[PDB]
Write a protein that binds this ligand. Structure first.
Ligand code: CHL
Ligand code: CLA
Ligand code: CLA
Ligand code: CLA
Ligand code: CLA
Ligand code: CLA
Ligand code: CLA
Ligand SMILES: CCCCCCCCCCCCCCCC(=O)OC[C@H](COP(=O)(O)OC[C@@H](O)CO)OC(=O)CCCCCCCCCCCCCCC
Ligand SMILES: CC1=C[C@H](O)CC(C)(C)[C@H]1/C=C/C(C)=C/C=C/C(C)=C/C=C/C=C(C)/C=C/C=C(C)/C=C/C1=C(C)C[C@H](O)CC1(C)C
Ligand SMILES: CC1=C(/C=C/C(C)=C/C=C/C(C)=C/C=C/C=C(C)/C=C/C=C(C)/C=C/C2=C(C)CCCC2(C)C)C(C)(C)CCC1
Ligand SMILES: CC1=C(C/C=C(\C)CCC[C@H](C)CCC[C@H](C)CCCC(C)C)C(=O)c2ccccc2C1=O
Ligand code: SF4
Lengths: 159, 88, 742, 43, 222
């Protein structure tokens, strides 16, 4: 079940059931970071929403104010601050890596060898759209989790 | 008396059954190899024996000892499970 | 066929070679030009494989050297028994074990050293021992000094026999190569002849000697009035007065009436409440069953009668579903390389020793052992250290195999190739898991130290705070403690008192064993142990797997097993050899074993050992401080090292002053090693040039030109002195503490 | 031979062992005869 | 030639060249390859013959004191079982003229003279007829075979002269009457352990009423 990658053993890896099964390829090709024919803004928005939604729990349950009546607000604010730090880091990486006007450095070949248009994400403008989407989605996702957990007070398991 | 008891017959039965299995091609032997467990092959003992079937003196003792082991196990299991008297 | 074939008079016995040092080496036999020669002479002495490329000669030398080692071991045992017979208080100890301290070494009165002859009791003055020979001798039924004398004489005769056998089997009749490669017959003889019959004979000794003697000993009978061991043999009435089942002889054995022997063949479990050790009848049944198991095992392989499994057939039959037969070619590899066999055997013996150390503290097999705290601590620590060293040696000699014996053009193996073809993935994943374990184990201690220092104890990880309970261990303990009755109906009590089932055994007003509880601190320290072991594995496995090449040095196998570097280029290439990986692994092994023995010492002193009053109030040695204090580093520094060092540092002026002297000397040696570890040889050779000028000035410059130590020798001297200093420091600390306070 | 055994007894570690053993014996006997000395009292 | 448990490897070197050859080597200890030390066909044959010759008179001398005492020709004090004569102190003793241990040194001197003198002929035959030995050195020469010395001293009467095949028949008789004696010694050694009575006395119990057989003597009393 283990074979060379694309029939080329002399590349620095060998295909396994982990890296070549169609089940993994479908899931990884259905993720926002690999939708090469979608505008960077929406791809960044989905990422920001998901990560901001997930970051609420740790700050709200493990912090130094967990046994106080305002623990939910502290957790939400911690999630928002972390999202701000991550957005700053994304902008810095984009500035350092991509220059204005340079062509995309994304691979232009598929498994069979068919040429494809390069991904717009690996550019100065696409990365900026992705970063703005990530920030907006992160704030929205944090707010949504706070609203669902400590405003409506849905009946969860160990909230 | 010990002779004629339940324990005295089980050992004889097991030893006779194992000897018959070993000699008449029902089990591996010196001149009969085996790989999977059911495949009866045909080896050479390499020692002169009067018996024309290949049964060798070192091949009698193997089945003789297997019979003793199996019979002792069965007898002690029967004694512990109840179905026979603990001391005979 | 399996036949005994030798060669007659291979090597002539002469003194000519003794007068020519370096005779074994073609490059050393010339004589010295520099001091380096001398060091080389000792470094290459037992490397037979490099002396010649002939396998048969290597095998013959190995056989003779093993005989020599057996002769030395017999000398050691003869000395132990003679010193026990001549200069000990064993006879007095036989009459009051709980109040008298064992002693078998005495010193001469010069320069004031006679103060070391301390007051151990029983009208005797000397040095207290912790090897546990007294308990072993009592368990063997020994009651007189004459018997010990006879055993020592027998051991001297055996040592002579082993040395003569070495001489004969090397210089007179040397076996051929086919003799050594009969692995089926060797396995048959060592499984059945050595282990099975050895256990059978010892079980017979226990049944016919040890049990009746210990009956009188525990009955309160003066040792000089006990019947002699041969009286129980030629007078069966005397033996039948204690065990009535000896009246019927061996008839139940052959008639399958074995239940008649239940008097001295039991399945009790637990401990004897008088001696605090395992029941002797359980040990006898154990050795009988083990003997049967090994006797049956030693009939599996085929030698001369066409019956039995061939070893090559088993390996070649299993094959693999992954497009090939993986286990094909291992028989040839394992029958032509001494180093690979040594690697596998060293690993197995080293792990077994750790098992022995763990099992002997929790199920104490000798009488009056559990309440002799110094002996218990000594035995556990000793066997831990031995096992660690053997395991490291396994990696070293596996690397030697990879460098010198691996050859895919003549002896191919598919599994070894497949492993070599994903070494990057293996090593990267081990690296990551090491980082994860280190963070989530040591950072917890760091977090606790910070929280405690900031006045926030309610945010710590502790039993009174955020709890991390080891639920799986508690569940396994509960299963084992309630095993007698359902899953093991034939056993009276559990295998150990530590499992649970509230009950305590006390001998002479001292606790032997009792249940051991587990909490947050135990969870933390167990994950620390996991961290240290995984890191040691990372280093040693990297050493073995990249021995022949890497992305940095494509032709490393041409440089050899033991070489210092390949130059300052490529960014720098110091310590790329496999020998350097072994060198680095020794440090992490030391770290791991030190933490293991510290955990053992503190936990046993805090939760097990202690005294008990008439009403049954247990007072522990350190009073249960482990649970709250061992969860910060400051706790280990203050409540363990600083508190328990008092005995060793206050020992001057008493019989324990030698331990204070060794404490200081071992700190000295440890610090001395750093000079070798931190520096390099160019500086030292430059200094030696200036010193040699001065010697030349006065016509005293030697012909053997002085040279600094080689780079490899510098590293070797460094690690050797580091380990000796650290281990000896801990040795003195433990022995003074446990002897004074226990 | 006697020549070869005399040659082997003259090698450096063996001769060092014998020399240091004799010296240690001499010092031990002297300290047994004149013990606990901090000075030279004869003259 | 009745071959007994003869293997394929054993038949190569066993070809009826030695007296009493029947071809029983189920282990191969007499294989000619890889010889050294003691394992060697000449030494093995010599050792078998010598142990048998010793066992002959060993078994004979361990029975006469009891039977001859029973028949009424030896005083009852002297007539005792063999294992009660002093060789095994825990199993009875007798007071002889000097000592249980001085007799050992007296015996060992005389036996060591004979054994050390016999060992030399095995190494270099005929070397005992050279040096002066009170005039008896002209007879202690040998024949050429250490096992069969012969000569006037070892053959005062010519029972093995004027024929050749008769000598082979006598060697074959010696092999049988020596192999029987070793098993007899083993039997009389085990019988005393399992019964504690004189071997000659044990004969009558089975001879008269064959009821007290081995099964009744399996409890292994003192
Ligand atoms: C002192 C013992 C002794 C020795 C050294 C020999 C030696 C020999 N026998 Mg002989 N025998 C001995 C006793 C006996 N043999 C026989 C029956 C035979 C036969 C039928 C034949 C021989 C033959 C041979 C020769 C070749 C076989 C061989 O491998 O020899 C080397 C073998 C050994 C040195 C084995 C030694 C074993 C050792 C004495 C005992 C080992 C432990 C025992 C298994 C258990 C002992 C327990 C105690 C309590 C008794 C060789 C000269 C063959 C031949 O051609 O002869 C001319 C042959 O055909 N022997 C009997 C009667 C049962 C013996 C009884 O004591
Ligand atoms: C420190 C770790 C941590 C903690 C304490 C929490 C805590 C919480 N998470 Mg979060 N979560 C975490 C890590 C953590 N999470 C991680 C690593 C992921 C990604 C695998 C998620 C993905 C996640 C989801 C998808 C959801 C939560 C939700 C929740 C809440 C309810 C959980 C429940 O009922 O079960 C709770 C506040 C739920 C929530 O907030 O619902 C409103 C919810 O839907 N978590
Ligand atoms: C049942 C027979 C038997 C027994 C008891 C032994 C015993 C031993 N063998 Mg083994 N061996 C056997 C058969 C046997 N062997 C056979 C058939 C072969 C050939 C295939 C080998 C080939 C072999 C090798 C190549 C080596 C051993 C070694 C050893 C030693 C391992 C260390 C140990 O546990 O010491 C435990 C110590 C003791 C129990 C105390 C010593 C007691 C005495 C000396 C035991 C003598 C056993 C021996 C079979 C006696 C033969 C006598 C006869 C030739 C006159 C040990 C003494 C190793 C060793 O160290 O050799 C020196 C070793 O290198 N054996
Ligand atoms: C106390 C001394 C010490 C320390 C702390 C380390 C640390 C380490 N060694 Mg080293 N080592 C030492 C002595 C030490 N070594 C010595 C004396 C030798 C010579 C024999 C070596 C030889 C050696 C080898 C040969 C190897 C290591 C490896 C490692 C790593 C193990 C992985 C791990 O746990 O990652 C987790 C990290 C830690 C446990 C470090 C502490 C982190 C703290 C608790 C948290 C910090 C919080 C936060 C980030 C603070 C930020 C502050 C901000 C202001 C910057 C780690 C970086 C191995 C490695 O690389 O494995 C992957 C390895 O192969 N060491
Ligand atoms: C580890 C133990 C050990 C082992 C495996 C061997 C193995 C061997 N020995 Mg040695 N031997 C040993 C210990 C051992 N010996 C000891 C302790 C002594 C006492 C000094 C001797 C004295 C001895 C003698 C005197 C002879 C052997 C001989 C033999 C060989 C035949 C053995 C046999 O027939 O069975 C065989 C190579 C025989 C030989 O050299 O055969 C060629 C032989 O004559 N051995
Ligand atoms: C350097 C001294 C020396 C030594 C160590 C030996 C050693 C030996 N000689 Mg040699 N010999 C020597 C000098 C020596 N000899 C000299 C100088 C000569 C030249 C004349 C000879 C001439 C010689 C001959 C001709 C023979 C020997 C033999 C022997 C062997 C005897 C073995 C034995 O079992 O003896 C057993 C004896 C003892 C262990 C000593 C017992 C001593 C007892 C207690 C003395 C009691 C005396 C008694 C009171 C006297 C009165 C008794 C009466 C009342 C009944 C032995 C290897 C014999 C041999 O085997 O040759 C192959 C042999 O035939 N030697
Ligand atoms: C070949 C010579 C020989 C002869 C003539 C006898 C004769 C006798 N033996 Mg003895 N015996 C012998 C060899 C011999 N034995 C040997 C080689 C052994 C094994 C070492 C024994 C072990 C033995 C025992 C344990 C006993 C006798 C006893 C006896 C007596 C009754 C028969 C019996 O049960 O035998 C038993 C013989 C065997 C089980 C094996 C015999 C094997 C040979 C090859 C036939 C009888 C006087 C019994 C006795 O004393 O009764 C009063 C008794 O208890 N024998
Ligand atoms: C402990 C069990 C770990 C999982 C083994 C799972 C297992 O058996 O996998 C299958 C395979 C070995 O099993 P197979 O049935 O394929 O046997 C092939 C034989 O030729 C050799 O075993 O292992 C690997 O490929 C890598 C195993 C190391 C771990 C990889 C992660
Ligand atoms: C007289 C007298 C007197 C007084 O009173 C007392 C006294 C002193 C006691 C006495 C004496 C005695 C004596 C001297 C004896 C001797 C004996 C002997 C020698 C034996 C052997 C004996 C011997 C013997 C048994 C032997 C045996 C053997 C055998 C089995 C073998 C077998 C075999 C063979 C073949 C070969 C193959 O491959 C293997 C086998 C199969 C294994
Ligand atoms: C001659 C002949 C015949 C007959 C034969 C016979 C009759 C045989 C028999 C045989 C036999 C009859 C054999 C046997 C054997 C046995 C054995 C070999 C055994 C073994 C055992 C063992 C080894 C045991 C063990 C044990 C013990 C000790 C204890 C515990 C348990 C057990 C079990 C583990 C016929 C007619 C056919 C043909 C013609 C000829
Ligand atoms: C100290 C040191 C040295 C110098 C140390 C040396 C040369 C060791 C000297 C050992 C002894 C003292 C040499 C003399 C041995 C004689 C046999 C002594 C004869 C006199 C006695 C009998 C009294 C190195 O060469 C070195 C090399 C590489 C890394 C680190 C270091 C390093 O740290
Ligand atoms: S510093 Fe030493 S070990 Fe490193 S490359 Fe230079 S010589 Fe080699």
């Amino acid at each position: 079940v283990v074979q060379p990658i694309n029939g080329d053993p002399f590349i620095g890896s060998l295909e396994t059931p982990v890296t070549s099964s169609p089940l993994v390829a479908w899931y990884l090709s259905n993720l926002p970071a690999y939708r090469t024919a979608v505008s960077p803004l929406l791809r960044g928005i989905e990422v920001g929403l998901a990560h901001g939604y997930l970051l609420v729990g740790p700050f709200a349950l493990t912090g130094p104010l967990r046994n106080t009546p305002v623990h939910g607000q502290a957790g939400a604010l911690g999630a928002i601050g972390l999202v701000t730090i991550l957005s700053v880091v994304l902008t810095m990486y984009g500035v350092a890596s991509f220059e204005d006007g340079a062509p995309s450095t994304a691979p232009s070949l598929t498994l069979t060898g068919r040429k494809k248009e390069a991904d717009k994400l690996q550019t100065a403008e696409g990365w900026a759209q992705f970063t703005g989407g990530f920030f907006f989605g992160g704030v929205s996702g944090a707010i949504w989790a706070y609203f669902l957990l400590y405003v409506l007070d849905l009946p969860y398991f160990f909230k | 008396d010990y002779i004629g008891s339940s324990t005295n017959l089980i050992m004889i039965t097991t030893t006779t059954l194992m000897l018959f299995a070993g000699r008449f091609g029902l089990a591996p032997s010196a001149n009969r190899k085996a790989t999977a467990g059911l495949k009866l092959e045909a080896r050479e003992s390499g020692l002169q024996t009067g018996d024309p079937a290949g049964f060798t003196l070192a091949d009698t003792l193997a089945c003789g000892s297997v019979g003793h082991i199996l019979g002792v196990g069965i007898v002690l299991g029967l004694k512990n499970t109840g179905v026979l008297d603990q001391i005979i | 066929e399996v036949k005994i074939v030798v060669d007659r008079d291979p090597v002539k016995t002469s003194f000519e070679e003794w007068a020519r040092p370096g005779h074994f080496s073609r490059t050393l036999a010339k004589g010295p030009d520099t001091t380096t020669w001398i060091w080389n002479l000792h470094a290459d002495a037992h490397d037979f494989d490099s002396h010649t490329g002939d396998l048969e000669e290597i095998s013959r030398k190995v056989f003779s050297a093993h005989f020599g080692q057996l002769s030395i071991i017999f000398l050691w045992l003869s000395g132990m028994y003679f010193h026990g017979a001549r200069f000990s208080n064993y006879e007095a100890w036989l009459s009051d074990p709980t109040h008298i301290g064992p002693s078998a070494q005495v010193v001469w009165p010069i320069v004031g050293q006679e103060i070391l002859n301390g007051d151990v009791g029983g009208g005797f003055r000397g040095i207290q021992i912790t090897s546990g020979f007294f308990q072993l001798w009592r368990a063997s039924g020994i009651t007189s000094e004459l018997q010990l004398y006879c055993t020592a004489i027998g051991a001297l005769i055996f040592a002579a026999l082993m040395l003569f056998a070495g001489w004969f089997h090397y210089h007179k009749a040397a076996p051929k190569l086919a003799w050594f490669q009969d692995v089926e017959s060797m396995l048959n003889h060592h499984l059945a002849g050595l282990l099975g019959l050895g256990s059978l004979s010892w079980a017979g000794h226990q049944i016919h000697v040890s049990l009746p003697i210990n009956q009188f000993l525990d009955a309160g009978v003066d040792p000089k009035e006990i019947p002699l061991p041969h009286e129980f043999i030629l007078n069966r009435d005397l033996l039948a007065q204690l065990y009535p089942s000896f009246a019927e002889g061996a008839t139940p054995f052959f008639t399958l009436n074995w239940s008649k022997y239940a008097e001295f063949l039991t399945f009790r479990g637990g401990l004897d409440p008088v001696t605090g050790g395992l029941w002797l009848t359980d040990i006898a049944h154990h050795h009988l069953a083990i003997a049967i198991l090994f006797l049956i095992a030693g009939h599996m392989y085929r030698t001369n009668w066409g019956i039995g499994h061939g070893l090559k057939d088993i390996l070649e039959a299993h094959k693999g579903p992954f497009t090939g037969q993986g286990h094909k070619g291992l028989y040839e590899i394992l029958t032509t390389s001494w180093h690979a066999q040594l690697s596998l055997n060293l690993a197995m013996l080293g792990s077994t020793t750790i098992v022995v150390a763990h099992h002997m503290y929790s199920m104490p097999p000798y009488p009056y052992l559990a309440t002799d705290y110094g002996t218990q601590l000594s035995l556990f620590t000793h066997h831990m250290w031995i096992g660690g060293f053997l395991i490291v040696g396994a990696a070293a000699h596996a690397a030697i195999f990879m460098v010198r014996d691996y050859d895919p053009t003549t002896r191919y193996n598919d599994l070894l190739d497949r492993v070599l073809r994903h070494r990057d993935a293996i090593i990267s994943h081990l690296n990551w898991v090491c980082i994860f374990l280190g963070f989530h184990s040591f950072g917890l201690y760091i977090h606790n130290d910070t929280m405690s220092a900031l006045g926030r104890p309610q945010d710590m990880f502790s039993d009174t705070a955020i709890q991390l309970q080891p639920i799986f261990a508690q569940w396994v303990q509960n299963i084992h403690a309630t095993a007698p009755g359902v899953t093991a109906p034939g056993a009276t009590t559990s295998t150990s008192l530590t499992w649970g089932g509230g009950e305590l055994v006390a001998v002479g007003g001292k606790v032997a064993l009792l249940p051991i509880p587990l909490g947050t601190a135990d969870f933390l320290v167990h994950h620390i142990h996991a961290f240290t072991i995984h890191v040691t594995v990372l280093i040693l496995l990297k050493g073995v797997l990249f021995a022949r090449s890497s992305r940095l040095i494509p032709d490393k196998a041409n440089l050899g097993f033991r070489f210092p570097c390949d130059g300052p280029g490529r960014g720098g290439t110091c310590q790329v050899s496999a020998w350097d990986h072994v060198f680095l692994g020794l440090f992490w092994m030391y770290n791991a074993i030190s933490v293991v023995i510290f955990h053992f010492s503190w936990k046993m002193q805090s939760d097990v050992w202690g005294t008990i009053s008439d009403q049954g109030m247990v007072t522990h040695i350190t009073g249960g401080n482990f649970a709250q204090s061992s969860i910060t580093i400051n706790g280990w520094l203050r409540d363990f090292l600083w508190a328990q060092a008092s005995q060793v540092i206050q020992s001057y002026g008493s019989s324990l002053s030698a331990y204070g002297l060794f404490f200081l000397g071992a700190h000295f040696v440890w610090a001395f090693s750093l000079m070798f570890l931190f520096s390099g040889r160019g500086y030292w050779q430059e200094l030696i040039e200036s010193i040699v000028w001065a010697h030349n000035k006065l016509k005293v410059a030697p012909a053997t030109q002085p040279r600094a130590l080689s780079i490899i020798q510098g590293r070797a001297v460094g690690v050797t002195h580091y380990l000796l200093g650290g281990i000896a420091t801990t040795w003195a600390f433990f022995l003074a503490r446990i002897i004074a306070v226990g | 031979s006697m020549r070869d055994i005399k040659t082997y007894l003259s090698v450096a570690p063996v001769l060092s062992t014998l020399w240091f053993g004799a010296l240690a014996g001499l010092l031990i006997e002297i300290n047994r005869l004149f013990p606990d000395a901090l000075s030279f009292p004869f003259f | 030639r009745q071959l007994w448990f003869a293997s394929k490897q054993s038949l190569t070197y066993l070809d009826g060249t030695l007296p009493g050859d029947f071809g029983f080597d189920p282990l191969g200890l007499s294989d000619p390859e890889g010889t050294g030390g003691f394992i060697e066909p000449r030494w093995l044959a010599y050792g078998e013959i010598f142990n048998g010759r010793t066992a002959m008179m060993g078994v004979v001398g361990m029975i006469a004191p009891e039977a001859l005492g029973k028949v009424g020709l030896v005083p009852p004090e002297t007539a005792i079982p063999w294992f009660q004569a002093g060789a095994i102190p825990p199993a009875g003793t007798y007071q002889y003229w000097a000592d249980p241990y001085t007799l050992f040194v007296f015996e060992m001197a005389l036996i060591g003279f004979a054994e050390h003198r016999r060992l030399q002929d095995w190494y270099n035959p005929g070397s005992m007829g050279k040096q002066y030995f009170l005039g008896l050195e002209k007879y202690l020469g040998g024949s050429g075979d250490p096992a069969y010395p012969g000569g006037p001293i070892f053959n005062p009467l010519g029972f093995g002269t004027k024929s050749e095949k008769e000598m082979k028949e006598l060697k074959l008789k010696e092999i049988k009457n020596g192999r029987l004696a070793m098993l007899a010694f083993l039997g009389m050694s085990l019988q005393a352990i399992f019964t504690g009575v004189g071997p000659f006395q044990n004969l009558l119990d089975h001879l008269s009423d064959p009821v007290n057989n081995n099964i009744l003597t399996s409890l292994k009393f003192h």
